[PDB]
């Protein structure tokens, strides 16, 4: 019902989301789009 | 006494399901070179 | 009783038709002074050499142009930063062909829109209303700030500044965007989202109460005689306005808190504005818009275009044909 | 009664608390001074020019003269991790002092001590707390004064022979300088304080100012408001958070254009040409080049009727020519060598230009303060390869934004501080709405 | 009580999502033209149709992703998957451009499908449907661009790809080709948004800065009760306020909110015919009086003829890349270039 | 202010609920990765690999110029790379 | 297209010996190239005189030929006009200069032929792009 506590479950998606943007934001400089 | 499956339900995970897979994908991509 | 005191009570009067006020006093004389020197040089002053090339460009309606394309037209090149007043000319003919009048105009004018933001600060005051309706005027005051002076800082001239015209401010914008990529820019991305967001609010706010209205008229009456100005009660039902459009989306995206809901109209706008004004005040110093030419390359090291390339070949239009007479060496550095 | 995104409103008259924020605050811009600071060395590569790394903190600590020799070359990398390194340190200081008085220490000091306990509408107390701080601020500018009279002096890049490190033995003391800068025009060719061009100047103006705030400190300690302040003011913490923020607002945009224009306290050798220098270079650049190739660029008539390499300003003066001539106010070493007492001199640009003029100019139209948000380097229509903008250019976006919510943040608080007072600031009082007890306007 | 009925009580009842007849057309519609996009920008290319890469998988951000219009060689097919073009195949259907006309086909129906849901939620709550009708302006821009004006050119190629930078290349084409600027609708139109912009932050502004005071706390925000009856802010404070530093102010609250609806949808309103007489090169691109003037005159000179040089730059140094199935070869010398540039 | 479903506060926040989801939203995100890297992405959709957008000396687009040919002319355009 | 073998070949001088960089090696010449030289010669121009490009057929008629790995090594250490006639090491970039242009101070030998290596590859890559200037980009 209540078991986990929001305020966790709210920073580890937080976290999660940072991950992601933060993988995308190193491939502009890496790879195929980077200008290398 | 709430019941699982509902019409919200279904809008939630048809937005959701794909959303995860794409961004599995994209995730992929960031590691190709060229 | 003292001379002194019944002045200021006339100006601080909240009796006069229009309010003057403290900032009212440096407002009418400085809102006077351009606006009569707008007028008069938009009918009638001569061509300006606004680029400092001895090749004049005619602005006004009396040499031959029509609304769309007259303008007063910004200062000298020559001139750069330099303060151009009446006085510092040798000659009225000298201060017209030079472009004196656009600095009159947009200096007096900045002045003038600075104390209007203030008197507006002031008769809330006097009202005792809250305070803060200036600081959603700030938001078109500082885009104003930018185009008219923060811009012409930091590329050296006023003749870089927006001239005061229909067609000039086309011409502002599309230079614009070859040399700093505009488009490419966040800050002004926010800006459109600011102001079609803006627009669509307006729409929805203004559609959701008249959606509401409680049936006050006949079908042979305009229904805005069902408000009476000043009655107490409201004029509309939020709560059926609330009951359709939480059913239009869904409950919790929908607003029931008035104050919350016309704080979101006041925040959308001015924050997106706040924005694009920063963002014109920023590629004042030439931090310009993303550059992703020649981003995707194949293989072999092929460029495969995207629409980034698409949109560089069309500002290398502007570009090369821009103050097509004013260019000696091949960088336009500002 | 706030709302928890306006908390810190709950502060304003718990003294105690309120201490602990601004300590632990200071903590957090004495960190970010030295983590960058050891994030920059860290980086740092000595055989780019400083320009080409995105240092900004390193240029400051160079400018007062430590790490650097003859042209600006850095020589010795240690001094800039010192100040990384005891700025770090400090920071766990103030974070200790800051957590403790958020936490654990009095929630308020009044109960605790009389000397540091403080009310805000007592103006005494509250003028000798201004008065503290003045004295403190005189201080850190006798401080700088110290650095460039008796201990090494400070980066010059007018010195003749490229650019050195100098002791400045005569600070300028004359007031009709040091005032006359303040009351300078600043519209171009004059620039209001921004002008400033010589160390000697700059010294002399914060031995001035140093003297200024102690001497205002000791006024404000030992006095109180008179009755015509007492009346023009309001008297409460927002209403002096508002008046800082407006101050801090006007700093803001000066200090942009200082960045912007100056290269003097802002050496181009650390921090890149400014705009109006790289576009001077550009101008010189092909003058050099087509003089060499027989080009008499004295009598080369341009598209326009002007002349194509050298033209004259609206009081005469010979000036590059092009689009440039809105910039020739620009004043720099590399450029002064050509200049005689009508502007730029045809008999030295025939004769005296020299390879090392060449070269800087080369180098300053090359490395023009434009570029792309992710760093590519040059107008908006060229293709990606250089990685590079100009610290001048992040310097003064950053500050012309932060300067422009400060003037919103002014505005704010000024209105609400205002309207707190009066008693109307959560608003109508419906039973005494005073519009209603006007007459009508019509 | 037949079987219709009995589908009129489901599609109708009070659930998180309201569905209605309505949603049969829209949840389809909306959820295909916003899968096709999300789809054809992570993972289709417009190598084929324009020369273009254009999704995440070849290195595309963001800002460059695209769903591109189809080649200009298809004219106005449909494009459908089993149509004689892919002939069913999906691959190639792809290659062909054909998540474009799947994703505006679907896009037009899905407006459709919510406009019908406005109208079909404001019929059972029971209030007036000036929502449904002030969303016709949002129809008739989508329908005028990204339908009548490519039908009235050579190829559905000319209409707007559905992504960020390439929206951006079709507002500067506008301005090179059509001289959009110019245009006397579509600055009605820029009128009709800015202005609502305007109407919105002040209509916000002044409700918040004329509060009654109905609580104790900093916080205006708590004493707001949805069912109170009393207005929240004063009007009369408002009006007096306006009066004396604009001149004018609003009076009647119903006639200000209507205003509201009538600035930005009439604005939209007056772009989209503009953009119509587009579709058929009936540009307002030129004053005559002005060109018979320059054409004898070489010393007149206005921002007029200043931008038609811009847009001369434009036209010729994107066409090439822009038109790439013309094989535009402009050689050098050619090139409409300033001194220097 | 309630229609029936179960709140998202009070699912998000249950056990039974993480326990299900922290098996289906990984096996999502790998699913999807593997999509690109075993190249299956590439051939359901015909998008060039980096090394197929031209041929070796090719300076040409492959652009289709036939409306009714156009299937064919891709195909053409393809086997121009094997 | 691929970055093949016959891409990577190159004259090593004027005698018409050829040399087969590695892929390696053009890596890392354009990331030397773009460190020392793109700040001038981005996209194989030259932006303070722009008369003078970086093609291959440029190269090929200056004197000392330019258009091989040895003659552009040469330019390097000891650069001079088109015409061979005055050596410029004090306003261009090299060896003989490092002390004036100190991003030259830490390239080794192999660093040179790289930096030639990818100047003489990247005209068989881009074509008219390189050297062409804003008309091609
Ligand atoms: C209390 C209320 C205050 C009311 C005051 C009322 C009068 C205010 C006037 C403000 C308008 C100033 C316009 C600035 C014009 C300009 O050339 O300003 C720049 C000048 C610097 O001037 C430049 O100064 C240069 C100094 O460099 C010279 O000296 C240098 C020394 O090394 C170098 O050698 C350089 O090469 C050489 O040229 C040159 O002289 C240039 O010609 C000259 O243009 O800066 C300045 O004086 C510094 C300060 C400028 C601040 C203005 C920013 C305005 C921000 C408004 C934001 C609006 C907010 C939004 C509201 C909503
Ligand atoms: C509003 C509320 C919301 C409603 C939204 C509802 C969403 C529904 C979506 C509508 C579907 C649109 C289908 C349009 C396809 C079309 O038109 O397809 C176009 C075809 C005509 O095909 C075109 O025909 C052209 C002319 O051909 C002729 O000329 C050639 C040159 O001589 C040759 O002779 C050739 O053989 C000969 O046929 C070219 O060949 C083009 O390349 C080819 O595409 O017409 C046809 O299908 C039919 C033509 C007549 C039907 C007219 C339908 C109305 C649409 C037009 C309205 C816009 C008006 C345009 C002016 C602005
Ligand atoms: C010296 C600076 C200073 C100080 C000490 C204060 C102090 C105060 N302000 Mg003022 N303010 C300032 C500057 C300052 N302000 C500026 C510059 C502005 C203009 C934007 C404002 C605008 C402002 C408003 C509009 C209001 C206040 C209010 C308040 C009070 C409550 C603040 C609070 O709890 O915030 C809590 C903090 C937050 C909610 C966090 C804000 C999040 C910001 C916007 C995002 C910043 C992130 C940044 C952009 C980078 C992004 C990175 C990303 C990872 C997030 C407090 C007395 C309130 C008040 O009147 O109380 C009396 C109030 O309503 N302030
Ligand atoms: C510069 C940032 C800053 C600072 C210094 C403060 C400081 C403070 N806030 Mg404010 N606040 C801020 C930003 C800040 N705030 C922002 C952005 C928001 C919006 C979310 C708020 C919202 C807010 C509210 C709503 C309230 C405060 C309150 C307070 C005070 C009491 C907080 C307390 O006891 O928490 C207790 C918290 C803890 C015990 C958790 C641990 C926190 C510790 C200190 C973290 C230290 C980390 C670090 C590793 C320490 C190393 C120590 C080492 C150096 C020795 C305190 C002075 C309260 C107040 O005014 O009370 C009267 C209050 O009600 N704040
Ligand atoms: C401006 C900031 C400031 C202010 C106003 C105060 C004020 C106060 N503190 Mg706090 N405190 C601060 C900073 C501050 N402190 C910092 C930075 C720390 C961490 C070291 C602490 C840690 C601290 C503790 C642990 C305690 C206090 C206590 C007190 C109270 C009594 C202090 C006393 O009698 O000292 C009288 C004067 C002296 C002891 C002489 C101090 C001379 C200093 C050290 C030299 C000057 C420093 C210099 C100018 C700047 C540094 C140079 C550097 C850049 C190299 C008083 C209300 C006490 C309290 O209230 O308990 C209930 C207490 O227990 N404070
Ligand atoms: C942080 C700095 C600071 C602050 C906040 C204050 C604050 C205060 N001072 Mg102190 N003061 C300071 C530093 C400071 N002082 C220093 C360093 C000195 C020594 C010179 C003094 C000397 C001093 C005296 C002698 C007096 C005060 C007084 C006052 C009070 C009234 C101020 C007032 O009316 O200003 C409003 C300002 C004006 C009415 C005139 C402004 C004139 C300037 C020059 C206009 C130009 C502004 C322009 C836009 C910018 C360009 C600069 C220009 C010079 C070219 C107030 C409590 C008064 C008081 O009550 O004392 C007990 C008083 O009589 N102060
Ligand atoms: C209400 C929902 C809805 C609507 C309005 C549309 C509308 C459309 N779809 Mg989309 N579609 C939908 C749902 C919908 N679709 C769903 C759920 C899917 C997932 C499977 C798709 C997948 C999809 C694809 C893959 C494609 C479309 C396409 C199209 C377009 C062409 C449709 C066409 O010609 O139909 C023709 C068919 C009909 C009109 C059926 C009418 C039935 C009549 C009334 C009865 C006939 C009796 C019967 C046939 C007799 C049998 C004979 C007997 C002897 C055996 C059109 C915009 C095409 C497109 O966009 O191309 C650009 C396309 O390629 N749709
Ligand atoms: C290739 C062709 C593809 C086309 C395929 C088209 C098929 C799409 C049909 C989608 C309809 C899904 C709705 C049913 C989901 C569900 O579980 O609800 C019905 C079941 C029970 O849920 C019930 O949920 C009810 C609430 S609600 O109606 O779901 O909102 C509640 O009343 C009840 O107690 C509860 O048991
Ligand atoms: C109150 C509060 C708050 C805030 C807090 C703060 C802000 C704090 C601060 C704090 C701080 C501000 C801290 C700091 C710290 C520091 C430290 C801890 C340091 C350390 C150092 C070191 C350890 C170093 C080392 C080294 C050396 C020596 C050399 C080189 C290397 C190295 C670098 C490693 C919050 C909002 C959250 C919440 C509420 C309340
Ligand atoms: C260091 C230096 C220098 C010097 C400087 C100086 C010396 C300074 C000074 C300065 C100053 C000396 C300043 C002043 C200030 C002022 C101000 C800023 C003012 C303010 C005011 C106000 C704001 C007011 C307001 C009001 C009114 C008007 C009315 C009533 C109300 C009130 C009061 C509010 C130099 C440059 C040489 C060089 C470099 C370094
Ligand atoms: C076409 C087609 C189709 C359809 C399909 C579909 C239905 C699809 C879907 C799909 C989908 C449905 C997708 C999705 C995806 C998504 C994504 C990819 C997302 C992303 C996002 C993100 C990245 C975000 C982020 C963020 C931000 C930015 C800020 C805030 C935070 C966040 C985190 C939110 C079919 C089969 C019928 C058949 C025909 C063809
Ligand atoms: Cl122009
Ligand atoms: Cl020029
Ligand atoms: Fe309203």
């Given at each position: 019902?209540?078991?986990?506590?929001?305020?966790?479950?709210?920073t580890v998606?937080?976290?999660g989301?940072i991950?992601?943007?933060?993988?995308?934001?190193?491939?502009?400089?890496?790879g195929?789009?980077?200008?290398? | 006494?709430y019941?699982?499956?509902?019409?919200?339900?279904v809008?939630?995970?048809?937005?959701?399901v794909?959303?995860?897979?794409?961004?599995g994908?994209?995730?992929?991509?960031?590691?190709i070179?060229? | 009783?003292?001379?002194?005191?019944?002045?200021?009570?006339?100006?601080?009067?909240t009796?006069?038709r229009?309010?003057?006020?403290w900032?009212?006093?440096?407002?009418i004389?400085?809102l006077?002074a351009?606006?009569?020197?707008?007028?008069?040089?938009?009918?009638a002053a001569?061509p300006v050499?606004?680029?400092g090339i001895?090749?004049?460009?005619?602005?006004s309606?009396?040499?031959?142009?029509?609304?769309?394309?007259?303008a007063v037209?910004?200062s000298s090149?020559?001139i750069?930063?330099?303060?151009?007043?009446?006085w510092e000319?040798?000659?009225?003919?000298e201060?017209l062909?030079?472009?004196?009048?656009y600095?009159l105009?947009?200096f007096?004018?900045?002045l003038?829109?600075?104390?209007?933001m203030?008197?507006?600060?002031?008769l809330?005051?006097?009202?005792?209303?809250?305070?803060?309706?200036?600081?959603?005027?700030?938001?078109?005051?500082?885009?104003?700030f930018?185009?008219?002076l923060?811009?012409?800082?930091?590329?050296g001239?006023?003749?870089d500044?927006?001239?005061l015209?229909?067609?000039?401010?086309?011409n502002?914008?599309?230079?614009?965007?070859?040399?700093?990529?505009?488009?490419?820019h966040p800050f002004?991305?926010?800006?459109?989202?600011?102001?079609?967001?803006?627009?669509l609010?307006?729409?929805?706010?203004?559609?959701?109460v008249t959606?509401?209205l409680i049936r006050?008229?006949?079908?042979?009456?305009?229904?805005?005689?069902?408000?009476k100005?000043?009655?107490?009660?409201?004029?509309?039902?939020?709560?059926a306005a609330?009951?359709?459009?939480?059913?239009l989306?869904?409950?919790?995206?929908?607003?029931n808190?008035?104050?919350?809901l016309?704080?979101?109209l006041?925040?959308?706008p001015?924050?997106?504005?706040?924005?694009?004004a920063?963002?014109?005040?920023?590629?004042?110093?030439?931090?310009?818009?993303?550059?992703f030419?020649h981003?995707?390359?194949?293989?072999?090291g092929?460029?495969?275009?995207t629409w980034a390339?698409?949109?560089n070949?069309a500002?290398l239009?502007?570009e090369?044909?821009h103050?097509?007479?004013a260019?000696?060496?091949?960088?336009?550095?500002? | 009664?706030?709302?928890?995104?306006?908390?810190?409103?709950?502060?304003?008259?718990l003294?105690?608390?309120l201490?602990g924020?601004?300590?632990?605050?200071?903590?957090?811009?004495?960190?970010?001074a030295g983590a960058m600071?050891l994030?920059?060395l860290?980086?740092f590569?000595?055989?780019?020019?400083?320009?080409?790394?995105?240092l900004?903190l390193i240029?400051?600590?160079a400018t007062?003269?430590?790490?650097?020799?003859p042209?600006?070359?850095?020589?010795?990398?240690?001094?800039?991790?010192?100040?990384?390194?005891?700025?770090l340190?400090s920071?766990?200081?103030?974070?200790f002092?800051?957590?403790?008085?958020?936490?654990?220490?009095?929630?308020?000091?009044?109960?605790?001590?009389?000397?540091?306990?403080?009310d805000?509408?007592?103006?005494?107390?509250?003028?000798?707390?201004?008065?503290?701080?003045?004295?403190?601020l005189?201080?850190g500018?006798?401080?700088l004064?110290?650095?460039?009279?008796?201990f090494?002096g400070?980066y010059?890049?007018?010195?003749?022979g490229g650019?050195?490190v100098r002791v400045?033995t005569n600070?300028?003391?004359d007031p009709?300088?040091?005032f006359g800068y303040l009351?300078?025009?600043?519209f171009?060719?004059?620039?209001?304080?921004?002008?400033?061009?010589?160390?000697?100047?700059?010294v002399?103006?914060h031995?001035?100012?140093?003297?200024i705030?102690?001497?205002?400190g000791?006024?404000?300690?030992?006095?109180?408001?008179?009755?015509?302040?007492?009346?023009?003011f309001?008297?409460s913490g927002?209403?002096y958070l508002?008046?800082?923020?407006?101050?801090?607002?006007?700093?803001?945009?000066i200090a942009?254009?200082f960045?912007?224009?100056?290269?003097?306290?802002?050496?181009?050798?650390f921090?890149?040409?400014?705009g109006?220098?790289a576009?001077?270079?550009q101008?010189?650049t092909?003058?050099?080049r087509?003089?060499?190739?027989?080009?008499?660029?004295?009598?080369a008539?341009?598209?326009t009727?002007?002349?194509?390499?050298?033209?004259?300003?609206?009081?005469?003066?010979?000036?590059?020519?092009?689009?440039?001539?809105?910039?020739?106010?620009?004043?720099?070493?590399?450029?002064?060598?050509?200049?005689?007492?009508?502007?730029?001199?045809?008999?030295?640009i025939?004769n005296?230009?020299?390879?090392?003029?060449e070269?800087?100019?080369?180098?300053?139209?090359?490395?023009?303060?434009?570029?792309?948000?992710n760093?590519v380097?040059?107008?908006a229509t060229?293709?990606?390869?250089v990685?590079?903008?100009?610290?001048?250019?992040?310097?003064?976006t950053?500050?012309?934004?932060?300067?422009?919510f400060?003037?919103?943040?002014?505005?704010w608080?000024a209105?609400?501080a205002?309207?707190?007072?009066?008693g109307?600031?959560?608003?109508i009082?419906?039973?005494?709405?005073?519009?209603?007890?006007?007459?009508?306007?019509? | 009580?037949?079987?219709?009925?009995?589908?009129?009580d489901?599609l109708?009842?009070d659930?998180?999502?309201?569905?209605?007849?309505?949603?049969?057309?829209?949840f389809?519609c909306a959820?295909?033209?916003?899968?096709?996009?999300?789809?054809?920008?992570?993972?289709?290319?417009?190598?084929?149709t324009?020369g273009?890469?254009?999704?995440?998988?070849?290195?595309?951000?963001?800002?460059?992703?695209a769903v591109?219009?189809?080649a200009?060689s298809?004219?106005?097919?449909?494009?459908l998957?089993?149509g004689?073009?892919?002939?069913?195949?999906?691959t190639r259907?792809?290659?062909?451009?054909?998540?474009?006309?799947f994703?505006?086909?679907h896009?037009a129906?899905?407006?459709?499908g919510?406009m019908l849901?406005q109208?079909?939620?404001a019929?059972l709550v029971?209030?007036?449907?000036?929502?449904?009708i002030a969303?016709?302006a949002?129809?008739a821009?989508?329908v005028?661009?990204?339908?009548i004006?490519p039908?009235?050119?050579?190829s559905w190629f000319?209409?707007?790809?559905?992504?960020?930078?390439?929206?951006?290349?079709?507002?500067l084409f506008?301005?090179?080709?059509?001289?959009w600027?110019?245009?006397?609708f579509?600055?009605?139109?820029?009128?009709?948004?800015?202005?609502?912009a305007?109407?919105c932050?002040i209509?916000?502004?002044?409700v918040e800065?004329?509060?009654?005071?109905?609580g104790?706390?900093?916080?205006?925000?708590?004493?707001?009760?949805?069912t109170?009856?009393?207005?929240?802010?004063?009007?009369?404070?408002?009006?007096?306020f306006?009066?004396?530093?604009?001149?004018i102010?609003?009076?009647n609250?119903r006639?200000?909110?209507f205003?509201?609806?009538?600035?930005?949808?009439?604005?939209?309103?007056?772009?989209?015919?503009?953009?119509?007489?587009?579709?058929?090169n009936?540009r307002?691109?030129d004053?005559?009086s002005?060109?018979?003037?320059?054409?004898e005159?070489?010393?007149?000179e206005?921002?007029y003829?200043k931008?038609?040089?811009?847009?001369?730059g434009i036209?010729?140094?994107?066409?090439p890349?822009?038109?790439?199935?013309?094989?535009?070869?402009?050689?050098?010398?050619?090139?409409?270039?300033?001194?220097a540039? | 202010?309630?229609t029936?479903?179960?709140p998202?506060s009070d699912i998000?926040?249950?056990v039974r609920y993480?326990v299900i989801?922290?098996?289906?939203?990984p096996?999502?995100?790998?699913?999807?990765?593997?999509?690109?890297?075993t190249?299956?992405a590439?051939?359901?959709?015909?998008?060039?690999?980096?090394?197929?957008?031209?041929?070796?000396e090719?300076?040409?687009?492959?652009?289709?110029?036939?409306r009714?040919?156009?299937?064919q002319?891709?195909?053409?355009?393809?086997?121009?790379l094997? | 297209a691929?970055?093949?073998?016959?891409?990577?070949?190159?004259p090593?001088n004027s005698?018409?010996?050829?040399?087969?960089?590695?892929?390696?090696q053009?890596?890392?010449?354009?990331?030397?190239?773009?460190?020392?030289?793109?700040?001038c010669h981005?996209?194989?121009?030259?932006?303070?005189?722009?008369?003078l490009?970086?093609?291959?057929?440029?190269?090929?008629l200056?004197?000392?030929?330019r258009?091989?790995?040895?003659?552009?090594?040469?330019?390097?250490?000891?650069?001079?006009?088109?015409?061979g006639?005055?050596?410029?090491?004090?306003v261009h970039?090299?060896?003989?200069?490092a002390?004036?242009?100190?991003?030259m101070?830490?390239?080794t030998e192999?660093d040179?032929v790289?930096?030639?290596?990818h100047?003489?590859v990247?005209?068989?890559?881009?074509?008219?792009?390189?050297?062409?200037?804003?008309?091609?980009?």
């Amino acid at each position: 019902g209540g078991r986990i506590p929001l305020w966790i479950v709210a920073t580890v998606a937080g976290m999660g989301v940072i991950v992601i943007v933060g993988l995308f934001f190193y491939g502009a400089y890496a790879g195929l789009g980077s200008s290398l | 006494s709430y019941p699982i499956f509902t019409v919200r339900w279904v809008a939630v995970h048809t937005l959701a399901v794909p959303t995860i897979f794409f961004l599995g994908a994209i995730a992929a991509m960031q590691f190709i070179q060229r | 009783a003292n001379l002194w005191e019944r002045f200021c009570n006339w100006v601080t009067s909240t009796d006069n038709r229009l309010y003057v006020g403290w900032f009212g006093v440096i407002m009418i004389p400085t809102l006077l002074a351009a606006t009569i020197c707008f007028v008069i040089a938009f009918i009638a002053a001569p061509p300006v050499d606004i680029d400092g090339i001895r090749e004049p460009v005619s602005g006004s309606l009396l040499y031959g142009n029509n609304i769309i394309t007259g303008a007063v037209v910004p200062s000298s090149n020559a001139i750069g930063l330099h303060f151009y007043p009446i006085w510092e000319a040798a000659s009225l003919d000298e201060w017209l062909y030079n472009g004196g009048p656009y600095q009159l105009i947009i200096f007096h004018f900045l002045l003038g829109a600075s104390c209007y933001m203030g008197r507006q600060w002031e008769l809330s005051y006097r009202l005792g209303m809250r305070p803060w309706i200036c600081v959603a005027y700030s938001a078109p005051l500082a885009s104003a700030f930018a185009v008219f002076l923060i811009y012409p800082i930091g590329q050296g001239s006023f003749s870089d500044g927006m001239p005061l015209g229909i067609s000039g401010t086309f011409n502002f914008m599309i230079v614009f965007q070859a040399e700093h990529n505009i488009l490419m820019h966040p800050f002004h991305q926010l800006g459109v989202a600011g102001v079609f967001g803006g627009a669509l609010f307006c729409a929805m706010h203004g559609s959701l109460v008249t959606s509401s209205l409680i049936r006050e008229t006949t079908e042979t009456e305009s229904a805005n005689y069902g408000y009476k100005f000043g009655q107490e009660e409201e004029t509309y039902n939020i709560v059926a306005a609330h009951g359709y459009f939480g059913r239009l989306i869904f409950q919790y995206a929908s607003f029931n808190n008035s104050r919350s809901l016309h704080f979101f109209l006041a925040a959308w706008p001015v924050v997106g504005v706040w924005f694009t004004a920063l963002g014109i005040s920023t590629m004042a110093f030439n931090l310009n818009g993303f550059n992703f030419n020649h981003s995707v390359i194949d293989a072999k090291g092929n460029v495969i275009n995207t629409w980034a390339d698409i949109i560089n070949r069309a500002n290398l239009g502007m570009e090369v044909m821009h103050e097509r007479n004013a260019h000696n060496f091949p960088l336009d550095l500002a | 009664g706030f709302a928890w995104w306006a908390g810190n409103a709950r502060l304003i008259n718990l003294s105690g608390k309120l201490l602990g924020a601004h300590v632990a605050h200071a903590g957090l811009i004495v960190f970010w001074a030295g983590a960058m600071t050891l994030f920059e060395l860290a980086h740092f590569i000595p055989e780019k020019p400083m320009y080409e790394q995105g240092l900004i903190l390193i240029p400051h600590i160079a400018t007062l003269g430590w790490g650097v020799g003859p042209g600006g070359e850095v020589v010795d990398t240690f001094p800039f991790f010192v100040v990384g390194v005891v700025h770090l340190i400090s920071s766990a200081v103030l974070g200790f002092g800051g957590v403790y008085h958020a936490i654990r220490g009095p929630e308020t000091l009044e109960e605790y001590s009389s000397f540091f306990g403080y009310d805000w509408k007592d103006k005494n107390k509250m003028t000798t707390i201004l008065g503290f701080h003045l004295i403190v601020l005189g201080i850190g500018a006798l401080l700088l004064v110290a650095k460039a009279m008796f201990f090494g002096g400070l980066y010059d890049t007018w010195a003749p022979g490229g650019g050195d490190v100098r002791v400045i033995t005569n600070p300028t003391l004359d007031p009709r300088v040091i005032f006359g800068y303040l009351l300078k025009s600043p519209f171009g060719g004059e620039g209001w304080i921004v002008s400033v061009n010589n160390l000697e100047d700059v010294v002399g103006g914060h031995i001035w100012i140093g003297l200024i705030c102690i001497a205002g400190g000791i006024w404000h300690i030992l006095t109180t408001p008179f009755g015509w302040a007492r009346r023009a003011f309001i008297w409460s913490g927002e209403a002096y958070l508002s008046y800082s923020l407006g101050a801090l607002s006007m700093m803001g945009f000066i200090a942009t254009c200082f960045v912007w224009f100056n290269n003097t306290v802002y050496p181009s050798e650390f921090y890149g040409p400014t705009g109006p220098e790289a576009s001077q270079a550009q101008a010189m650049t092909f003058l050099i080049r087509d003089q060499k190739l027989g080009a008499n660029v004295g009598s080369a008539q341009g598209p326009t009727g002007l002349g194509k390499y050298l033209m004259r300003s609206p009081t005469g003066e010979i000036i590059f020519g092009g689009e440039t001539m809105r910039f020739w106010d620009f004043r720099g070493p590399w450029l002064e060598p050509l200049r005689g007492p009508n502007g730029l001199d045809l008999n030295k640009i025939k004769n005296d230009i020299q390879p090392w003029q060449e070269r800087r100019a080369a180098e300053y139209m090359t490395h023009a303060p434009l570029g792309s948000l992710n760093s590519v380097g040059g107008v908006a229509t060229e293709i990606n390869s250089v990685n590079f903008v100009s610290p001048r250019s992040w310097l003064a976006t950053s500050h012309f934004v932060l300067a422009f919510f400060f003037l919103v943040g002014h505005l704010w608080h000024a209105g609400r501080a205002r309207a707190a007072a009066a008693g109307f600031e959560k608003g109508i009082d419906r039973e005494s709405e005073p519009v209603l007890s006007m007459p009508s306007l019509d | 009580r037949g079987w219709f009925d009995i589908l009129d009580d489901w599609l109708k009842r009070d659930r998180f999502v309201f569905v209605g007849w309505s949603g049969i057309l829209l949840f389809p519609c909306a959820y295909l033209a916003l899968g096709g996009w999300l789809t054809g920008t992570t993972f289709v290319t417009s190598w084929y149709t324009h020369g273009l890469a254009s999704s995440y998988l070849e290195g595309c951000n963001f800002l460059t992703v695209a769903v591109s219009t189809p080649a200009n060689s298809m004219g106005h097919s449909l494009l459908l998957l089993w149509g004689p073009e892919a002939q069913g195949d999906f691959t190639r259907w792809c290659q062909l451009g054909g998540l474009w006309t799947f994703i505006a086909l679907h896009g037009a129906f899905g407006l459709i499908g919510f406009m019908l849901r406005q109208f079909e939620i404001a019929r059972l709550v029971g209030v007036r449907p000036y929502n449904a009708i002030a969303f016709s302006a949002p129809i008739a821009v989508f329908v005028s661009v990204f339908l009548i004006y490519p039908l009235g050119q050579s190829s559905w190629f000319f209409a707007p790809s559905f992504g960020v930078a390439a929206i951006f290349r079709f507002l500067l084409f506008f301005q090179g080709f059509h001289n959009w600027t110019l245009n006397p609708f579509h600055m009605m139109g820029v009128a009709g948004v800015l202005g609502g912009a305007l109407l919105c932050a002040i209509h916000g502004a002044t409700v918040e800065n004329t509060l009654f005071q109905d609580g104790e706390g900093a916080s205006t925000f708590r004493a707001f009760n949805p069912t109170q009856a009393e207005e929240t802010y004063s009007m009369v404070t408002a009006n007096r306020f306006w009066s004396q530093i604009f001149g004018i102010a609003f009076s009647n609250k119903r006639w200000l909110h209507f205003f509201m609806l009538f600035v930005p949808v009439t604005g939209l309103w007056m772009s989209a015919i503009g953009v119509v007489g587009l579709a058929l090169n009936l540009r307002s691109y030129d004053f005559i009086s002005q060109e018979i003037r320059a054409a004898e005159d070489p010393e007149f000179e206005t921002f007029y003829t200043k931008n038609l040089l811009l847009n001369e730059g434009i036209r010729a140094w994107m066409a090439p890349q822009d038109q790439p199935h013309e094989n535009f070869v402009f050689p050098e010398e050619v090139l409409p270039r300033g001194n220097a540039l | 202010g309630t229609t029936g479903e179960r709140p998202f506060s009070d699912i998000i926040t249950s056990v039974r609920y993480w326990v299900i989801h922290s098996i289906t939203i990984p096996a999502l995100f790998i699913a999807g990765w593997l999509f690109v890297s075993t190249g299956l992405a590439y051939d359901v959709f015909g998008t060039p690999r980096p090394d197929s957008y031209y041929a070796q000396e090719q300076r040409s687009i492959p652009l289709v110029t036939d409306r009714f040919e156009a299937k064919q002319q891709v195909e053409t355009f393809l086997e121009q790379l094997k | 297209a691929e970055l093949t073998p016959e891409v990577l070949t190159v004259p090593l001088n004027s005698e018409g010996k050829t040399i087969t960089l590695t892929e390696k090696q053009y890596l890392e010449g354009k990331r030397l190239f773009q460190y020392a030289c793109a700040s001038c010669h981005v996209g194989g121009i030259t932006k303070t005189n722009p008369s003078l490009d970086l093609r291959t057929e440029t190269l090929a008629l200056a004197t000392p030929p330019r258009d091989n790995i040895e003659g552009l090594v040469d330019y390097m250490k000891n650069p001079t006009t088109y015409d061979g006639e005055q050596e410029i090491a004090e306003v261009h970039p090299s060896l003989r200069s490092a002390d004036i242009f100190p991003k030259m101070r830490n390239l080794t030998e192999k660093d040179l032929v790289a930096i030639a290596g990818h100047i003489l590859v990247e005209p068989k890559i881009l074509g008219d792009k390189w050297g062409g200037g804003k008309v091609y980009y």
